[PDB]
Amino acid sequence: SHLDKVQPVIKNSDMSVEMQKEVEEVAKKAIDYCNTDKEIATFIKDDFRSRYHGTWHCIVGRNFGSFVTFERSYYIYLYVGQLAILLFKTG
């Protein structure tokens, strides 16, 4: 019932709805699978890189400010608990 409890919410989303739904499942799976936050960032980048070819930069922290140059429609912003799963593919 932990998956129901997390209720991850995407504050800002710039991606197709079908792709966005897939990201939520990966984000929930990554948090339980990874013992530490640093492991979560590596797991999200590896899964997305395998799923979609390109260069992916992912940063997750309790408090942070980010300005980035990402390919249009490849940036999805979702916040679960105190962790921000942010991925932006840059060509």
Partner 1 sequence: TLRNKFNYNTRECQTINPSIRERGVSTEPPPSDTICGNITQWEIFDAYY
Residues of this chain that bind partner 1 (CB under 8 A):
37-38, 41-42, 45, 55, 61
**Which residues, including other chains, have CB under 8 Å from residue 6's CB and lie 6 or more apart?**
28, 31, 80, 81
Residue 37 or 71: the one with the smaller Cβ distance to partner 1 is: 37
Q: How far apart are CA 58 and CA 36, in angstroms?
A: 15
Residue 16 or 42: the one with the smaller Cβ distance to partner 1 is: 42
- What is the closest distance, in whole angstroms, from the C-beta atom of residue 26 to partner 1 in the complex? 18
For the chain, state the CA radius of gyration: 12
Residue 28 or 45: the one with the smaller Cβ distance to partner 1 is: 45
